[PDB]
């Protein structure tokens, strides 16, 4: 069995729990993981985005198989949301899909819950062990049938012509940490 994700605190991440998927670097590299527009005018639909300093906002990850003990582990495919209100006409779970003003496929809001069928399997991420201390990663390649559309990839933070942290996928990854929220 793959071997279990840790939060800082070296217990094991959990389903149904809220965490803060932060920067691995302290002091720099950035914060944690929040929502935010296209910096058009337009106030919706909301990306994925890291804060350049705060935790940001909670997240929850959820299965897309039961999980006995309920634990996340390595390179399983898994759900995540954050756990917050918003004012678009979207739900909080993140899928890969087109954002506006930004090239490439970004980490964005309206995703789905559970796998059925392809467009479902957008919503699924896999986290990896990553190189700095405690670090994870998040890889997209759904284990579930999907169209060819998405190229499988790490995700890693873009600075778009706003000077916004998107995240996108490719190549390169970047490496943040989990901590429970309470
Ligand atoms: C999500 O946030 C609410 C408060 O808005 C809180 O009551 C709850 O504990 C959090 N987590 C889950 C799993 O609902």
């Given at each position: 069995?793959?071997?279990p994700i840790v939060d800082?605190?070296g217990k094991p991440v959990?389903?149904?729990?809220?965490?803060?998927?932060?920067?691995?670097?302290?002091?720099?590299?950035?914060?944690?993981?929040?929502?935010?527009?296209?910096?058009?005018?337009?106030?919706?639909?909301?990306?994925?985005?890291?804060?350049?300093?705060?935790?940001?906002?909670?997240?929850?990850?959820?299965?897309?198989?039961?999980?006995?003990?309920?634990?996340?582990?390595?390179?399983?495919?898994?759900?995540?949301?954050?756990?917050?209100?918003?004012?678009?006409?979207?739900?909080?779970?993140?899928?890969?899909?087109?954002?506006?003003?930004?090239?490439?496929?970004?980490?964005?809001?309206?995703?789905?819950?559970?796998?059925?069928?392809?467009?479902?399997?957008?919503?699924?991420?896999?986290?990896?062990?990553?190189?700095?201390?405690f670090?994870?990663?998040?890889?997209?390649?759904?284990?579930?049938?999907?169209?060819?559309?998405?190229?499988?990839?790490?995700?890693?933070?873009?600075?778009?012509?706003?000077?916004?942290?998107?995240?996108?996928?490719?190549?390169?990854?970047?490496?943040?940490?989990?901590?429970?929220?309470?």
């Amino acid at each position: 069995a793959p071997k279990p994700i840790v939060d800082i605190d070296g217990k094991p991440v959990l389903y149904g729990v809220d965490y803060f998927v932060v920067s691995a670097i302290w002091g720099a590299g950035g914060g944690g993981l929040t929502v935010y527009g296209p910096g058009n005018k337009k106030k919706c639909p909301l990306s994925v985005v890291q804060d350049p300093f705060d935790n940001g906002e909670p997240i929850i990850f959820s299965a897309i198989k039961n999980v006995k003990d309920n634990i996340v582990r390595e390179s399983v495919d898994l759900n995540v949301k954050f756990n917050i209100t918003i004012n678009c006409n979207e739900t909080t779970a993140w899928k890969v899909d087109r954002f506006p003003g930004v090239i490439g496929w970004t980490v964005t809001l309206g995703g789905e819950k559970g796998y059925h069928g392809f467009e479902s399997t957008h919503s699924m991420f896999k986290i990896k062990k990553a190189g700095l201390p405690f670090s994870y990663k998040f890889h997209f390649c759904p284990s579930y049938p999907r169209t060819r559309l998405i190229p499988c990839n790490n995700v890693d933070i873009f600075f778009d012509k706003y000077r916004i942290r998107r995240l996108i996928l490719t190549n390169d990854a970047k490496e943040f940490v989990f901590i429970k929220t309470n």
